[PDB]
Amino acid sequence: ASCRTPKDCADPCRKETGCPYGKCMNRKCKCNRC
């Protein structure tokens, strides 16, 4: 998934991992765990 600012990964990262830790690295959601 792609983003605009890294808070746009808070919705796909809260759906796929479950916590909203993800960076906007060249329009890609680099998601993490809590």
Curated annotation (Swiss-Prot):
Cross-referenced Pfam families: Toxin_2 (PF00451)
Keywords, in A-Z order: Amidation, Calcium-activated potassium channel impairing toxin, Disulfide bond, Ion channel impairing toxin, Neurotoxin, Pharmaceutical, Potassium channel impairing toxin, Secreted, Toxin, Voltage-gated potassium channel impairing toxin
Any one Gene Ontology cellular component term annotated for this protein: extracellular region
Sites annotated Important for activity: Y21, M25, N26, R33
SUPFAM superfamilies from the UniProt entry: Scorpion toxin-like
A single MF term (Gene Ontology): potassium channel regulator activity
The record's account of how the chain is modified after translation: Amidated. The amidated toxin shows 5-fold more affinity for Kv1.3/KCNA3 than the synthetic carboxylated form.
Keyword field contains Secreted: yes
Subcellular location: Secreted
PROSITE patterns: SCORP_SHORT_TOXIN
InterPro entries: Scorpion_toxin-like_sf, Scorpion_toxinS_K_inh
Keyword Secreted set for record: yes
UniProt-reported outcome of changing R14A: Increase in selectivity for Kv1.3/KCNA3 over Kv1.1/KCNA1 (>2000-fold more selective). Very weak decrease in inhibition of Kv1.3/KCNA3 and important decrease in inhibition of Kv1.1/KCNA1
Transmembrane regions listed in the UniProt entry: none
SS bonds (residue pairs): C3-C24, C9-C29, C13-C31, C19-C34
Tissue: Expressed by the venom gland.
Sites marked Critical for activity (is inserted in the pore, pointing downward): K23
Domain comment, as recorded: Has the structural arrangement of an alpha-helix connected to a beta-sheet by disulfide bonds (CSalpha/beta).
Additional note from the record: Negative results: does not block Kv1.2/KCNA2 potassium channels. Does not induce hemolysis.
Chain's role: Potently blocks voltage-gated potassium channels Kv1.1/KCNA1 (IC(50)=7-11 nM) and Kv1.3/KCNA3 (IC(50)=11-29 pM). Also mildly blocks intermediate (IK) conductance calcium-activated potassium channels (KCa3.1/KCNN4) and ERG1/Kv11.1/KCNH2. Shows ability to suppress proliferation of lymphocytes, which are known to be sensitive to Kv1.3/KCNA3 homotetrameric channel block.
UniProt record similarity statement: Belongs to the short scorpion toxin superfamily. Potassium channel inhibitor family. Alpha-KTx 06 subfamily.
Protein name: Potassium channel toxin alpha-KTx 6.3
Organism of derivation: Heterometrus spinifer
